[PDB]
Design a protein around this ligand. Structure first.
Ligand SMILES: Nc1ncnc2c1ncn2[C@@H]1O[C@H](CO)[C@@H](O)[C@H]1O
Ligand SMILES: Nc1ncnc2c1ncn2[C@@H]1O[C@H](CO)[C@@H](O)[C@H]1O
Ligand SMILES: Nc1ncnc2c1ncn2[C@@H]1O[C@H](CO)[C@@H](O)[C@H]1O
Lengths: 279, 284, 280
């Protein structure tokens, strides 16, 4: 279904019947990071199956509640392009958030670390991105522009809101884990193969710090409709640049590193949310 | 949409040939804000895209839909006022049709303009950049306009893109700029295509600069590939309508309106430049 | 086209298994101009793609050839399926997954490529030791879509994709047979095609670390590694990429076919000699 104003309105009005929470903040949990949703108080869990026109080991959830005093909606489980979903499908949930009242989107993901100074388990705040699929004609906004949401040619300047980035740094710092925190450029590989050593070396040389297969499409849709964005990568593996190495990325090890840092990351987001300006 | 095969292209061309007697030798495509390169056409016939079967519609700002026939500096031209962009959702076949139609109408030379962001740090706002080469990012990544059964009536399966930007036309365009006092606005460089429609991020721009690109835009390469594929010679120029931002901490941003504005300020100079080039084209 | 799922792949494989009794351990795919690597196949059964349900056309059909080579049972794809032709992911994936159900353990592939690396000569062989998948990075990876669990994992790693023991063997064989000087190893980058690369594109690909550029192969290799088939791949340098926009020299497919024809017999001999020394 086209992520136009009519269909987005439908989905949003349905949800608005199943809950009274008007979210100001939207959160999306990446691979292995579903715990950032567990401190949500007065929560209402709505499975994607109960929502008409949302998409689909079992189902994902839309979770409404409060976190550090603020109203949030959490997407437990995202939609990936490598899974075969259309642009309209990936766009819809973000545009639905927009109509629910979301002003700030906070997204996490798991990524490989390209930058040679990164360690396993480090956090990399995104300050910029390289959208390889978008450069190559698979940008999520290809097609008729939905004018009710935003402009035909969006600019991506300050896409990773620099005030949110500064606040995220300051909160890490004050809570004793500033040393895990970096800022860098995320490049998206459509996937689903991990990157070869040749591909990793090339991505590093283009100026990329972390690589993953998600996140950019959601961020583009969010900036398109004027939602502010904060995004962080968990370094769940170190990319291998050397073809003679036996070390390889493995999705279980990604989930495992996720599980080890999920609580620290959950705590981080909650503390950030507590310090967000309230108007 | 309709396959850009010899049968369908013939239909469209024969229809147009009923609405006009002009046999074009030169085809012209106007980029964003550059519609005025068409206003000096004498003895003109304006045919809206709507009055042509199987042509598209165009819904972009700064692109009306007209096919304009007439003479320019003594030569017969057809002018696409308004082009078709991939970032709009159009198929390969839809973008390839108008250029293949030009081929059947008689076009030998194709002159294209477009608005672009300047990556090269020596470029100034309002500069002209003649394309001498391109980097077709969508084409490298399996979105080449020629993907699919080769239409043999038009060209070969594996076209070479050597001298795609005909070097004699580039030499002539430079000489004409020089003689008419605006040589200092003219550069030559490599155009890279971003599928779009997002403007490029600072990290994308930095990467594009480092790959050897001088200007970036979201058009043009597909049309050039179709034109070379069927043996049409090509001249192409970017207007620098903004300077790409390489620094993430900057507040400056690209804006469509400013692109249209810069286009408007230079459109007359560019029109004059094309007319002067066409006047010196060899004639048989 | 038909989903390359376990049900459909099983159908195609069971049909083939009625037309022949050969259980292949080794699969071979011939690139542009290289169809002769299939002519030494003894006790051969030629099955045209037309006589297989749900296989494609590469029209004028090619052939699936079963037989023995240097003592081993092989299946040969004479003629491959190219993304620039408009085939779906499922169509390119199916033949390789069929091989997997037929018993293939090792896949040997050849292709024609442009030489980017400035030390390459026309007619050189470049063994692939790694590959840049430009379409794959750009959301046209052959595995995009529901993962077919019966064949492989959701997120395959491509470490040792170009099996290093097969590469070492191939080198030793070239060496012992007097043509070690034609053999290099490098990185292959895929251009979706079908336009040859511009000089600015070539210069960029060279600078990214690429040794050869072609419009095929990587998708098949991804499907093969995904289902645990081991891979050996070689490019014939059939032209020298032009980096200079002022040059009049250009790639043309006839010259590609011509170089292929000149080297096809040496390459066929190379493959047969490699297969002879495969562990049994
Ligand atoms: N090294 C890596 N390269 C690309 N994606 C990764 C990497 N490590 C974790 N991921 C992410 O986690 C899943 C694959 O493990 C995907 O959703 C992907 O985005
Ligand atoms: N900085 C830029 N990057 C990519 N395309 C641009 C830029 N400036 C103008 N354009 C072109 O003009 C329109 C965007 O304003 C598109 O059609 C695109 O081709
Ligand atoms: N210089 C080259 N660049 C990209 N593909 C090539 C090149 N030379 C031969 N090929 C291959 O052979 C055909 C083009 O001649 C294609 O199938 C392609 O895979």
């Amino acid at each position: 279904v086209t992520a136009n104003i009519e269909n987005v309105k439908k989905v949003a009005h349905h949800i608005q019947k199943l809950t009274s929470i008007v979210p100001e903040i939207g959160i999306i949990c990446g691979s292995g990071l579903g715990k950032l949703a567990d401190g949500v108080k007065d929560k209402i869990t709505i499975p994607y199956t109960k929502i008409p026109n949302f998409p689909q080991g079992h189902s994902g959830n839309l979770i409404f509640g409060t976190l550090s005093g603020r109203k949030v909606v959490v997407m437990q489980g995202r939609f990936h392009m490598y899974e075969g979903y259309s642009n309209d499908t990936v766009a819809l949930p973000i545009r639905v958030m927009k109509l629910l009242g979301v002003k700030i989107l906070m997204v996490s993901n798991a990524a490989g670390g390209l930058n040679r100074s990164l360690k396993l388990g480090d956090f990399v705040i995104l300050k910029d991105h390289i959208y390889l699929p978008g450069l190559g004609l698979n940008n999520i906004l290809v097609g008729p522009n939905q004018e009710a949401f935003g402009t035909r040619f969006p600019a991506l300047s300050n896409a990773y809101d620099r005030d949110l980035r500064k606040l995220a740094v300051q909160v890490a710092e004050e809570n004793g884990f500033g040393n895990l925190v970096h800022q860098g450029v995320y490049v998206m590989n459509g996937g689903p193969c991990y990157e070869t050593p040749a591909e990793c070396t090339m991505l590093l040389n283009m100026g990329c710090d972390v690589v993953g297969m998600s996140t950019i499409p959601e961020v583009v849709i969010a900036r398109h409709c004027g939602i502010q964005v904060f995004a962080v990568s968990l370094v769940t593996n170190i990319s291998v640049l050397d073809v003679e190495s036996d070390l390889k990325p493995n999705h279980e090890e990604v989930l495992a590193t996720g599980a080890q840092r999920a609580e620290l990351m959950q705590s981080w987001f909650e503390k950030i949310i507590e310090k967000l300006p309230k108007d």
